[PDB]
Amino acid sequence: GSSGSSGALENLQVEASCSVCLEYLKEPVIIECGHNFCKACITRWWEDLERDFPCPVC
């Protein structure tokens, strides 16, 4: 029996995470919009050279 693992009780550290899969990453791709996107995701949409395109999530 071991409790106390996850939670925001108290810790000096900030991190982000994808929006689609909601996975924890070290360096999330912050597109123009701002939302977080992982290579696995950001890629699914950024498949073509459609640089000019609105955020999918928004």
Ligand SMILES: [Zn+2]
């Ligand atoms: Zn993702």
Ligand SMILES: [Zn+2]
């Ligand atoms: Zn967005």
